């Protein structure tokens, strides 16, 4: 019996917690003697202040204290972000406010003053009574007029952002010797993750001062490292506790001003502090994303093959870096080329500042915005060259042949180098088999008195190792069960299930008996976290050589327990059959026997100096094509997405049932970005989309009756097991394909630039009939 | 979140309610449903000192076919409009119109009496009820008024209800017999506050001219709007894509809407325009009986 | 200045407690009736999670002051499970991976509950979508939920 578990559809381990409601979330936590923090936020977009009136706030009963800026610029550093630095140069700042500075305000929703009261009702009751008089300054909003820079945000100025540049060989000759040279600029919409759980933090101090407990949800819960350094009380003593999270999409990823204010205030009062975000707040305070300006250029010959490709990008970072370091901007500038033959290139990314909510990293950050413009310049190019988008992408995709194809673009640091180590294979048979699966041609064939069709491709910077390591640990027990410690984090995508399978496979124990513990920094003093579709080959790779450390620790230890040497039958139950077929020793009894007999019955080998797990220089790049067909009502602005199918090649799907969730779910978040979601600021500076009535989240009825999934496990990469990151591959080309279809269905020019596609824009067909 | 502090009471009777909030507050408010008041509280956009819960008062809950009209209690739930009588002539337009009001969860607690007194510019009910020529009885401590729907709707979020007084019941006249009623709206997602919508109702002359027509507009200004002159076109004239198109294209010329987030001014005028003719389409067909179907 | 005494039935257990009128039902059902099962996402009758059974009808625990619920039956997601055995709705939701994060699970489940318990109707993909539509999710999106609900209604009725 060699029961296999990886690749199998097994129902999630997380399911029952969430279904019954036994699972606790950050907002669910209660601690006796709690104080409830409410935050007085900005009402100006750009303003310096004189704030001294919390008098009637301080004097309403039930309120224990009101925290001003002067409390917190103290010690009271300003929000550091970490490695990925060089640095070039420099950093400060942003970081955010970073904590309430008693001088200037750089966006509506910025923390200025925190109150502390007994119940959250009384907390904001006192928050109203706080008065701050403002000097309104001029307001910056357009990324392009940020750097043509009058109206400077920082008085030190403090050039807006960081300028990233990457460019191969001889693009001067690649362009100069081209027949069709194509220039167009694209604009992406400002939108984010907007998960269902708003941000929430609970801090309990151990006033014995020794320590501090944080049931806050800080999204690398092993980034106590920041709070520690900031508060100067490091590094244990800041012991983080595990909580379930209601979705993040990287939008919650990192340290916020709220996190430190609470932690500081908790420490210096010896009193537990609780914080729970407004949705409204979330819309003006939680990290933004997606807003770019994509000037692009192409070099093409009479064949239609690529020769040269690129110009400048303007990433609008909002007002501040927020562990939203060039990281994403650096990634974006690395992969606006995707999985194509691109002889040369010229990135000049301008990460810039405006009076908006500080930009973090939304699901597939910088790659939704880039694979849009890239596929919106390719579609446009087919208009002049004259012939099909299908057979353009078809023969200048990614020659292989070529593979390994060390590019092709830069000067390749994505995010460091060198890459693209595209050792993973056949670029094309995906697109080929993806349309041989099976329609596309079948309703390009349309009697089409309705409307039309679209395409788009997405490669992914999706195992950001991180580099070198990731920790893991497996433990067998006296009670039948198995325990797995990991540096992973259940944002709700099924890590605790995937790892259980990985361990199940290697240990020959049902994934039911295995439990997984994460984000509890007392058990797990070191872990990396969960971002950039990574946690399987990294943390699952940790789980493997952990479970593989026990099998030796056990099988070796079992040969000593009976007297048979390490050869037997073949050895799994999980237990130990020597011979064929006398006797046996179970895997748990082995562990139960290693008690206080001079020892210990467990493993945790990742890692040491010269790390473990080892994933270094080159990450895997998964690639995928999205296929869409839309109908449109022209007398109004309506549309009904008739068909949808994202198909992505990624070696070794670990859990097919759950990966389907990660593909479909993401794809919808893409349609949300493509046709519904935009943060609208009024020309003076105030946010307009603050409620849910304004910001449009896709609902059940409007979505495609099915997103089809075409994944194949050809060409496993060489990081055993040969698997890929898949938690982002849904949204990548969701924007471009929708756009192409809309332009194909009208039909004028293939000339759409700005997302989203509002119903007002989409009667420019009233023009067509006129 | 976090609504302001207030005192709270449940009224026993229709004049008990009037009696208490009168001396209770210059700024005492009524509640009933909550789906508009309670959220206005979590946004701290309202500061009642006293809240009067009338949601538990006997009479105002039923539906009657009195005389040549139809009586509806003010506390009648949106859901009990999609169900069940429903009412006479039934479907009337309302079960077709209420089916747009947000979702079942909200429709389960939102009252007709609330939406009319709240009077959101984009509220689906008043738009319909104006096309039916509604009549709203409003009891007060002093006496009892009856106000037609035309004067009632003042502005967005403003009604002509005097402070203190209470909307008791809405009665709609049961129109003619065998007439056409339809309602359609456009919105990004099914159930959102619509960009543009229309409710058109046609009565056939059989011999088949048009005897009477009433037309209203969702989101033409600050309130529902009768297109009294666009109706004049249809009168005496028959069927026809053109008379329909001519009627619809002439209902929007007198309209200046508000923007911006979901659409611009002239934009909405053109969406409403296709809403009028489209409703007029099914405003026939439904007008066919003589039954035997 | 003003305290109010609640006499409410919650998931069977009747409670008597004094609460300030302004506390919302959601906050009351989480404190101190520590039934964290009910979850709060939006703040104005949209997110869905909010949703609870009030007197048989699904309403938002978030547009109702706790005080308005006096002398009424209330049921939350905690009340589905009956002696270890997950209520079939919960089973098919896991059988079809109808949930990844957890938030949009109280909301949908409680919306679907009275619909389930009453003998009609069938729920086909189209009518299934319309049913859950009152609840938002940012993870699935719905495809599997719609697939999950349908499955639940087949083992319900036609059932071998
Ligand atoms: C087109 C449309 C879209 C909608 N969309 C949404 C949505 O997206 N989300 C949502 O949550 N809800 C929505 N609603 C519901 C809307 O809030 C309704 O007004 C609902 O009925 C609110 O409950 P209520 O008005 O009965 O009680 P409340 O909302 O408590 O009433 C609010 C106000 O009405 C007054 N009032 C109520 N009854 C009376 C009376 N008998 N006499 C005098 N004054 C009275 C009160 O003084 C109070 O100030 C929508 C409704 C419509 C028509
Ligand atoms: N059942 C699964 C789950 C994940 N994977 C893949 O294996 C890795 C393990 O996941 P993880 O490392 O956590 O991926 P990320 O750290 O990038 O996070 C997951 C991904 O997809 C997500 N899925 C989410 N789902 C829910 N319900 N809620 C969130 O907040 C989520 N947030 C995310 C975010 S953020 C991203 S980017 C990922 O590469 C994923 O593609 C898989 O094969 N099978
Ligand atoms: S938060 Fe109360 S309904 Fe969404
Ligand atoms: S809401 Fe995040 S998983 Fe459904
Ligand atoms: Mo992410």
PDB file of C-alpha atoms and ligand atoms in Angstrom, chain C residues 26 39-51 60-63, ligand 3:
ATOM      1  CA  UNK C  26     -23.931  42.336  15.394  1.00  0.00           C
ATOM      2  CA  UNK C  39     -18.777  38.287  11.107  1.00  0.00           C
ATOM      3  CA  UNK C  40     -18.713  41.988  10.165  1.00  0.00           C
ATOM      4  CA  UNK C  41     -17.125  43.281   6.922  1.00  0.00           C
ATOM      5  CA  UNK C  42     -18.929  46.253   5.374  1.00  0.00           C
ATOM      6  CA  UNK C  43     -20.922  48.498   7.723  1.00  0.00           C
ATOM      7  CA  UNK C  44     -24.116  49.255   5.814  1.00  0.00           C
ATOM      8  CA  UNK C  45     -25.952  46.101   4.793  1.00  0.00           C
ATOM      9  CA  UNK C  46     -23.698  44.982   1.925  1.00  0.00           C
ATOM     10  CA  UNK C  47     -20.783  42.647   2.810  1.00  0.00           C
ATOM     11  CA  UNK C  48     -23.044  39.708   3.678  1.00  0.00           C
ATOM     12  CA  UNK C  49     -21.128  38.017   6.510  1.00  0.00           C
ATOM     13  CA  UNK C  50     -23.223  40.208   8.830  1.00  0.00           C
ATOM     14  CA  UNK C  51     -26.275  38.104   7.964  1.00  0.00           C
ATOM     15  CA  UNK C  60     -28.400  41.949   8.497  1.00  0.00           C
ATOM     16  CA  UNK C  61     -27.340  41.957  12.176  1.00  0.00           C
ATOM     17  CA  UNK C  62     -25.783  45.302  11.310  1.00  0.00           C
ATOM     18  CA  UNK C  63     -28.672  47.508  10.243  1.00  0.00           C
TER      19      UNK C  63
HETATM   20  S1  LIG D   3     -21.821  44.758   7.685  1.00  0.00           S
HETATM   21 FE1  LIG D   3     -23.902  44.640   8.490  1.00  0.00          FE
HETATM   22  S2  LIG D   3     -24.619  43.841   6.532  1.00  0.00           S
HETATM   23 FE2  LIG D   3     -22.541  43.946   5.727  1.00  0.00          FE
END
